[PDB]
Structure 1
């Protein structure tokens, strides 16, 4: 059994005038994450952890701005494509764990919807997908609500 681990990181600024989308879930809130597309910090971190575990580089190498098929794709579509490319390299996904660091808003009521989005997109049972939520105890830009961070870890195995 040829197991591999991957880890992922993402951060985006938290600004008025964009929706707040994390884990494929749109969360009603006065601000949203700034970046390309939906700036879904959680799905990007997971996407990188999966590419990382398959040793397939990173999210930036896979999906560019000029990409004719993936310009106009949201972060769930990128995740589904990532899962396909991980399978192409010979790996089946075993589990995902993650942490969202956000001072606000409260994320607890939206976690299980995030897990269901991720589980569906990866064709995993719900109980192989975990998402945890943290504040930053008012420390740094995260503590001041200037951005939201996601951290992810993934376990795969070669078929």
Structure 2
């Protein structure tokens, strides 16, 4: 068959004054991302990438009247991928954040993502890493997400 891979990347600053929302989940924390859902953006990009449809910013413009939260954008991304003729086979991802502890929220993120993509739960994975106190990530000045997606025509 006609398999394709895509990859995705995103990053946002972490400062006091905003909520922390990752993978559709609000996480109690003294800082927040400037909805800024890094995980969902990275996955969205990975999906557009696999389908060879450009990137998230080309589809969902900052100014566009029609566009909403990152979960809504993920659902629209999936519909556009479906229409291009592709079925999603799996998603894997990594969140790099020095803090807070993300492990408790992983299943919720996975359920949110699988729901939005209409995928069996066992085809969505989310992982978490600190940056070992290195760089802006290790200083808690930002949070990064990475994603990989496999699709088939």
TM-score interval for Structure 1 and Structure 2 normalised by the shorter chain = over 0.9
Structure 1 residue 68: Cα displacement: 1.4
Q: C-alpha distance in 2, partners of 1:97/1:65?
A: 27
Q: C-alpha distance in 2, partners of 1:66/1:99?
A: 29
Structure 1 residue 110: Cα displacement: 0.3
SS at match of 2:137: helix
Structure 1 residue 94: Cα displacement: 0.3
Structure 1 residue 15: Cα displacement: 1.0
Structure 1 residue 65: Cα displacement: 1.7
TM-score (norm 2): 0.99
Partner of 2:50: 53
Which segments of 5 or more consecutive residues in structure 1 lack a partner in the other structure?
A: none
Which segments of 5 or more consecutive residues in structure 2 lack a partner in the other structure?
A: none
Deviations 1:42-95 (A, max 9, x none): 00000000000000000000001221111xx10000000000000111000000
Q: C-alpha distance in 1, partners of 2:62/2:138?
A: 31
TM-score (norm 1): 0.95
SS at match of 1:42: helix
Q: Note the aligned Cα RMSD (angstroms).
A: 0.4
SS at match of 1:18: coil
Give structure 1 regions of 4+ aligned residues with deviation exceeding 4 angstroms.
Answer: none
Indicate yes or no: 2:152 matched with 1:153: no
Q: C-alpha distance in 2, partners of 1:109/1:66?
A: 35
Count of aligned pairs between the two proteins = 153
SS at match of 2:77: helix
Partner of 1:33: 33
Partner of 2:4: 4
Q: C-alpha distance in 2, partners of 1:19/1:145?
A: 15
SS at match of 2:126: strand
Structure 1 residue 112: Cα displacement: 0.5
Q: C-alpha distance in 2, partners of 1:47/1:97?
A: 12
SS at match of 1:141: helix
